From a paper:
The data were processed in the triclinic P1 space group with two trimers per asymmetric unit. However, the complete electron density map of six GlcNAc rings of chitohexaose was observed only in chains B and F, while the electron densities of the sugar molecules in chains A, C, D, and E were partial, missing mainly the areas assigned to GlcNAc-1 (nonreducing end) and GlcNAc-6 (reducing end) of the sugar chain. Structural analysis of sugar–channel interactions suggested that N-plug deletion led to the loss of five hydrogen bonds that interacted with the GlcNAc moieties at the central affinity site, thus drastically weakening the binding affinity of the truncated channel.
[name] contains three identical subunits, and in each subunit, the 19-amino acid N-terminal segment serves as a molecular plug (the “N-plug”) that controls the closed/open dynamics of the neighboring pores. [name] is a sugar-specific OM porin with the ability to selectively transport a range of chitooligosaccharides, chitohexaose being the most preferred. [name] consists of three identical β-barrels, each containing 16 β-strands connected on the extracellular side by eight hydrophilic loops and on the periplasmic side by eight short hydrophobic turns.
Author numbering:
A (entry chain B), B (entry chain A), C (entry chain C): 20 to 350
The structure:
């Protein structure tokens, strides 16, 4: 089966980086084309009861700040087996359990710069979409309790340049108009800044959907990191969103923040990030969506890693505001 | 909808660069596989009356002088809305209205080395296929008159590395068996040779299809560039083709040429290019063609950019002849 | 037609390079998703008797030791013509007649490290999947005898950086339950290690399918290399496999070896490779197979090339064992 998301975003960015020329280069209008084509199917094997499943999904065809063209396999790509009894098992390239919650609901709308790949902690706070991953998704036990669990090789292990690995787990419990989310990811043998690291991330969160038309989500994220030289790092973060849904319209206010990193008990000042985001969406069709969105990103103004060199963050390119109109179509 | 063009061209090139080894490297037989796979669709949104259109076309799967493999998104790839009243508007990666005229009819067959990317002027005479583009295509007003107009980001801006931008427009008016074409493209903030350029390119041409089997096109192209140091460059070009189509055969002669480049009033000697080209083509099927082609490219023998380093042109690799056969099958 | 091979291999590798960090980096578990998508078709042109055939195949979407994402055209991608009388001709990216036999049957299960790209000989023992190739595949004469023939441009010529080319031919004759195989490849103008090489490579082999469930294959390969500074190099190599097939199961033992390389008449000590492999496979469906596989690779411990630098071989990373299970599903 061939499927696709046609996603296009006309976004103007106004940067305040400290450098005028950097401002000009990074800012401006671009067309963020995140369309992707994918292939998926199921197969009932004669001599095996669990149904075989596989998916190959291509990447963004023409993103902003990037070249044209994407290959098949850049997004969620896997084989696996499923049965109503014990759920779904996927082998390959999937989202970690932690990341799936960080992305949804917490990174919408345009909260990702802060809540998704933002942060200042060393090592690996978590993977996002990872290859070399075994992920078990349980069924909806009693229609309320579900579990995601996964393990996989790290980024350098994926290329034969390392021994990094990671495990993760998330749970969800539905309680009427409420859902309680709890996730964890541990990362190990992460080689960065002349050190080996271990990372532990925990996430708690609630989302609510009321027949009154108001929906909301709130997430708390706690990030710990330990370097082989003895340094310990801590940073926490939050994300919250408020939605009002009337017919063919939806209103959304989002906010997310990274708080000052702490290193060996001392707080590194000016290492926090915050983003405020507003969006109106119009359900133009059962299968598609239009949207306008405006967001303000205020990132940290910089910090050094354990190798006494600047550590990269979603704030190195500097603070920016974004106005965008988008469309999104599913088939 | 899956679609494709299957294009294979077996081409032998004989170079005369002045260097025996370079002649040997660049020349010889190759297979130019410009086959490509596309996806496109329309969708009629319930709550929006203009038809939604989208397309994602892959790149040449295995071209001459290149590696194997093409991602999805490399050729025309866009989303838009179409309504018979006011035409179609596309956002994404399309051809600029200029380039579409310099490509067809004026770069066929094999004229493109001189008339497409050829030429000695600095800055950017025009974009070809460009990402981050809004393009309006008018209807054929009264079945005779059409306008193509577009603005977009530059090559550096698309990467966050510049502030270049451009707009263009082209007009066509069908007068019985003839079509008049005019177009323009301006590029701004182009960073090259250590200067900031503005380009302006002007194109006029004519195209004819008569009932006696004779067909033709001629175009005149005028290219001006202005550098921030006040340097002014000026270069013009022509391209013309004669075709005789009889039954299942089509004979074609093409000629294109760039004339000596003028910088600050002075003609730069020996900066011209010309290509003459013959082609026989067989309509093997309603969906496919076969063709042989021979062409002779005589390029300029070099010039210096505003940085006092040699400026790269389609002639840098050297004069060459080319004998090719190919097949093209649309599905 | 859309088609596909879904292929996933969970592989555990234990290396012994003599550096425990390299052993940790290279070793460990990976998921080797060699899944690919492809498009192929035929078309009877109205004015041409041979059937037009074409195919574009994508690459491994997420292989082990590599990154995610494959483009279209990475695997067999060609146009051509077939007729019952004289066979089929293909232009594009296909397998070399030699390499086809080297891959099947002689590289399975897991013998390719030694027998496919393994070996110590200079130049290019043979191409494998080569672009810029034209390949004739004969009909199966009298349902018994078949010929493959190809010529093609070399890797550097395909980028206009060289003049390497190659030719090859392969014969197959069915004798009762046996298949007899012979094949040859010549490569010319191969620029490596500061020299220009000519490679000649010869191959003979037999395959048997018996009615008691046993089948086997055995192949002998002889590779010769001649450098422009007058060095001559020879190496030979073998590969065999035993199989027993009952109901829905197949057992398989495989062995392959590269023998010591001889250079300028003097054999170079300790340049031989060895692989033993066992495999169990379960025909989990007419469309798919499960398999577990264990194999042991003992590679050469070093040789120098003609540029006084270590010559890369499949042994450079070091000796290693591999335990794996996989699934393969064709649609
Ligand atoms: C049912 C359900 O679950 N959901 C329903 C859903 O269908 C609907 O709502 C939609 O939800 C989906 C998710 O469910 C949303 O999809 C997400 O959308 C966002 C964007 O909209 C995607 O975000 C991208 O994520 C990747 C991370 O992997 C980002 O990658 C980063 O990109 C930046 C680019 O600037 C990189 O920066 C560069 O970095 C290099 C590296 O060092 C540096 O050198 C450079 O300086 C730097 N360059 C520049 C120019 O800055 C950065 O490194 C990189 N980071 C990483 C780790 O790769 C990518 O940029 C993100 N893109 C944007 C834009 O933010 C997200 O991945 C995607 N996920 C999924 C799973 O879909 C969707 O947005 C949402 N739609 C709408 C309209 O709201 C709704 C109904 O529609 O129903 C739900 O129920
Ligand atoms: C050049 C001003 C553009 C505004 C974007 C800046 C966003 C962060 O600034 C926060 C400071 O107040
Ligand atoms: C430093 C060791 C931490 C190990 C964490 C154990 C698993 C925690 O799961 C909690 C789910 O929330
Ligand atoms: C369960 C707590 C959710 C509320 C957190 C809001 C934090 C506000 O921080 C100040 C942000 O700056 C002004 C923008 O206003 C916030 C709008 O976001 C609404 C959050 O739902
Ligand atoms: C219906 C007959 C139309 C013939 C048009 C001929 C015009 C050619 O000259 C164009 C010059 O500008
Ligand atoms: C400096 C040489 C003059 C350039 C010749 C122009 C011929 C183009 O005419 C095409 C008609 O439109
Ligand atoms: C015309 C002097 C020799 C320079 C070689 C350029 C050949 C192309 O020029 C065609 C006419 O202008
Ligand atoms: C070493 C090659 C031997 C080839 C066997 C020839 C058998 C031909 O006749 C078989 C029946 O047809
Ligand atoms: C299976 C056919 C084998 C024929 C050998 C080809 C001869 C090439 O040798 C030329 C070396 O000089
Ligand atoms: C056609 C089957 C040939 C059998 C292959 C065995 C090759 C072993 O030779 C090693 C030479 O040293
Ligand atoms: C129909 C059963 C025939 C089995 C005979 C196999 C003989 C294998 O020897 C091949 C040597 O080359
Ligand atoms: C030093 C050479 C020893 C390896 C020879 C292996 C022979 C295998 O032949 C199997 C039957 O064909
Ligand atoms: C044979 C051939 O086409 N060569 C050129 C190459 O020299 C050039 O660098 C590239 C784009 O700059 O376009 C191509
Ligand atoms: Na990762
Ligand atoms: Na800031
Ligand atoms: Na190529
Ligand atoms: Na461009
Ligand atoms: Na810009
Ligand atoms: Na010349
Ligand atoms: Na090759
Ligand atoms: Na060559
Ligand atoms: Na060894």
């Amino acid at each position: 089966e061939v499927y696709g998301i046609i996603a296009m975003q006309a976004a103007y960015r106004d940067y305040d980086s400290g450098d005028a020329k950097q401002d000009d280069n990074l800012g401006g209008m671009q067309l963020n084309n995140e369309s992707r084509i994918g292939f998926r199917g199921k197969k009932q094997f004669a001599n095996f009861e669990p149904t075989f499943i596989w998916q190959i999904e291509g990447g963004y065809v023409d993103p902003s700040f990037g070249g044209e063209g994407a290959g098949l396999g850049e997004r969620d790509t896997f084989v696996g087996f499923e049965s109503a009894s014990w759920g779904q098992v996927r082998l390959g390239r999937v989202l970690t359990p932690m990341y799936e919650l960080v992305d949804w609901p917490a990174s919408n709308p345009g909260l990702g710069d802060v809540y998704d790949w933002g942060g200042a902690i060393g090592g690996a706070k978590y993977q996002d979409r990872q290859s070399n991953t075994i992920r078990w998704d349980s069924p909806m036990y009693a229609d309320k309790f579900s579990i995601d669990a996964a393990v996989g090789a790290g980024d350098k292990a994926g290329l034969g340049a390392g021994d990094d690995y990671w495990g993760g787990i998330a749970a969800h419990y539905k309680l009427g108009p409420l859902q309680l989310d709890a996730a964890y990811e541990g990362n190990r043998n992460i080689e960065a800044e002349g050190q080996t690291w271990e990372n532990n991330t925990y996430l708690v969160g609630v989302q609510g959907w009321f027949e009154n038309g108001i929906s909301f989500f709130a997430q708390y994220k706690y990030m710990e990191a330990d370097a082989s030289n003895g340094v310990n790092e801590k940073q926490d973060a939050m994300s919250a969103g408020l939605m009002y849904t009337t017919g063919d319209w939806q209103y959304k206010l989002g906010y997310a923040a990274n708080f000052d990193l702490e290193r060996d008990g001392k707080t590194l000042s000016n290492t926090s990030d915050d983003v405020v985001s507003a969006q109106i969406m119009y359900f133009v069709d059962p299968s598609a969506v239009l949207y306008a969105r405006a967001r303000m990103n205020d990132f940290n103004e910089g910090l050094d890693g354990l190798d006494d060199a600047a550590r990269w963050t979603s704030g190195t390119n500097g603070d920016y505001n974004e106005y965008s109109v988008g469309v999104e179509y599913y088939f």
